[PDB]
Amino acid sequence: TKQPEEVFDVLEKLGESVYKAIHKETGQIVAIKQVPVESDLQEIIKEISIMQQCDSPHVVKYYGSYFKNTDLWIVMEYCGAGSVSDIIRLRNKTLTEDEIATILQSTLKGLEYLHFMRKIHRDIKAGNILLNTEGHAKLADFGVAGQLTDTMAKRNTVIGTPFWMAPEVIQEIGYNCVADIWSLGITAIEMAEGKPPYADIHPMRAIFMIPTNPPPTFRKPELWSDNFTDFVKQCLVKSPEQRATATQLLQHPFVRSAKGVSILRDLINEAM
Ligand SMILES: COCCNC(=O)Nc1cc(F)c(Oc2ccnc3[nH]cc(-c4ccn(C(C)C)n4)c23)c(F)c1
DSSP, X not given: OOOHHHHEEEEEEEEOOXXXXXXXXXXXXXXXXXXXXXXXXXXXXXXXXXXXXXXXXXXXXXXXXXXXTTEEEEEEEOOTTEEHHHHHHHHTOOOOHHHHXXXXXXXXXXXXXXXXXXXXXXXXXXXXXXXXXXXOEEEOXXXXXXXXXXXXXXXXXXXXXXXXXXXXXXXXXXXXXXXXXXXXXXHHHHHHHSSOTTTTSOHHHHHHHXXXXXXXXXXXXXXXXXXXXXXXXXXXXSOTTTXXXXXXXXXXXXXXXXXXXXXXXXXXXHXX
């Protein structure tokens, strides 16, 4: 119930509108997203309602909102390294298997938690996985997330970002939490190659082919271990009923043996 600029000292812009700020009472660094109150709020409202219901170390926290002048200030957990796709672009380097194993282990714990709560993220991609400066990965951008309920055991909205969308999401048939596991497999290729399969095709053409085409594979299979190859194959099983869960993939040899967040220390330092 206090004015936002007496609670927060706003520092630099982080994105275009998102700012770094200090919570003046604890010295904790936060991210503040500022949107005009007169803008289209549909996805911000959806996003904030999903984040408010989540309490996981693997999901970006929401701390609250304020009116300031004619803007809405949305206060969130600060992830100082930015997104995985920011880190790939900034270093001009794809991630090693070990870096990918460590990031995807934390991503999978975030998926396991969301899936237990009957949430589907629906936009899993390197752009939507943020790292804090200590190297802990967090799921962000709940703008298109779905909620299963007792009476609605499936969603059927064709939604997501085309290159990352599961075949059953593109097709008319309903789907459930394991749509995110397909998106995770595409994200694994994205982190290893810098872009998803079909990145150079028109998105609306790519969406037409994903349901009919075989599961994608690495562009240069000889670069990658049997474990990494098998991990991607399990993620990209076309049958949703047969596809591995987040819990099961946490035991996959590629993930189960991942190094701690220290292997991301070089990576984060170079990026920042
Ligand atoms: C030219 O290409 C682009 C350049 N890169 C670039 O803009 N990266 C970048 C990456 C970010 F993650 C980013 O946002 C954050 C940064 C730190 N900590 C955060 N905590 C929460 C967020 C965040 C930002 C936006 N959201 C909404 C989905 C509600 N949430 C956040 C941002 F503002 C910018």
